[PDB]
Amino acid sequence: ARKALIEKAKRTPKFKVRAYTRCVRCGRARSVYRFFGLCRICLRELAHKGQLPGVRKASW
Amino acid sequence: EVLDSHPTDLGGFSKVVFEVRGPGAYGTFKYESGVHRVQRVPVTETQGRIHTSTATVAVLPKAEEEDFALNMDEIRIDVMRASGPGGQGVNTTDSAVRVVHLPTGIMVTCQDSRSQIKNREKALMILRSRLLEMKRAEEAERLRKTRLAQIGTGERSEKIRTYNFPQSRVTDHRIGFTTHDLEGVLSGHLTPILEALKRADQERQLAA
């Protein structure tokens, strides 16, 4: 139950509380960041490839 | 109810004997007799290898506890003079007793007391104990042969069922029945295998 779940989440529900976020890259439903729309795994992958503008490794 | 138990330090059993009480217990457990084979990575294994082990299951019908009594119609009693000291008493008294179990020819002689009555009673008691011992010995021999015919040597061959954990597979080789619910089977869900075995037993009597 992966493709159907992704499409159903992409669909409008009868109630507004039944809408939940999913990762726009791999379809994950857990740990999805609002700022990027991506899950933590995809976020790390894309950040290591320089494809996230202004995003850099943090160290202080 | 569990009758006998010999546990091991790691939580296994080297032997465990229990009772299933209920109408049709033996009829429904009679297909579990034989050698069961498991292929898996042991928890006692250090290098992570797969091992093939076996366990033997013996199923017997619970017997009866009929008491033993001597039928006097097949027993002959002789009385005669004893041997040894005693003077005119032992010369003239029929104190010595012999009891003979006619079907088998086994005889017991008693001369311990001066009294014929006590000697007769003692001889009958000894004869009863001897016949009871022989009956028990023959019963035990028959049961031992049945057990051996069921479990054999426990070798890896001659197995009756295989539980493959890496493949999550259960195979009954008597009927070629393979299923893939290993956890369910190990949790007590033996109905499909047993119904297949009963199917095979009913189909094997297709005569003519």
Binding site: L46, K49, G50, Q51, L52, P53, G54, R56 | -
Partner: protein
């Protein structure tokens, strides 16, 4: 888990971002999704052209997109017959104005993605793996690079047990930040599974 991504480690020091634009909290994710869509579409379009790098650049409702390929003619074609077409669909895939630029790579031997892609293509052709790694590393070293490394992981040659084969020459200082190291990755989908190809090329220190 052992090694950090060579490019991600040096972002803003030696390497530069592949996408360069500014967006606020309201527009970042939609533009990012559009960028991923564009890159995914172009990846399966110019594969035979030798696609190394795709750069997305946005000013105001207009996106640049500059691609770097081994053979620009494979992207442009006869009088641009393909160059226009790949642009038009892109607009129909973005709903904006696009300025697709084509750039030639001076040395295909010095671009780690191209080396990795070539090695993966050879592996897919049921070629020998060890010979391929040796030949690719030697080719890179023949073009003035100060060092090179190529690593292949998987069921090398269809074997039932996965292995890793690597070759190296020169210098590959992965712990040096001033070192300009180009990293490339490629996948080989053979009938027996997927093999991973990694390429490191060292081009001196800035």
């Amino acid at each position: 888990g052992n090694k950090i991504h060579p490019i991600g480690f040096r972002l803003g020091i030696t390497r530069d971002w592949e996408s360069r634009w500014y967006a606020g909290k309201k527009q970042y994710r939609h533009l990012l999704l559009e960028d991923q869509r564009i890159r995914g579409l172009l990846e399966k379009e110019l594969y035979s052209a030798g696609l190394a790098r795709v750069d997305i650049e946005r000013a105001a409702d207009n996106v640049a997109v500059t691609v770097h390929v081994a053979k620009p003619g494979v992207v442009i074609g006869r009088g641009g017959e393909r160059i226009r077409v790949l642009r038009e669909e892109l607009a129909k895939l973005t709903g904006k104005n696009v300025a697709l630029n084509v750039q030639e790579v001076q040395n295909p031997n010095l671009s780690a993605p191209l080396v990795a892609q070539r090695v993966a293509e050879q592996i897919e052709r049921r070629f020998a793996v060890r010979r391929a790694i040796k030949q690719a590393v030697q080719r890179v070293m023949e073009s003035g690079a100060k060092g090179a490394k190529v690593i292949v992981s998987g069921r090398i040659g269809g074997a039932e047990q996965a292995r890793t084969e690597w070759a190296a020459q020169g210098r590959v200082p992965l712990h040096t930040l001033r070192a300009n190291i180009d990293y490339g990755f490629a996948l080989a989908r053979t009938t027996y599974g997927v093999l991973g190809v990694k390429a490191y090329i060292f081009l001196g220190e800035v």
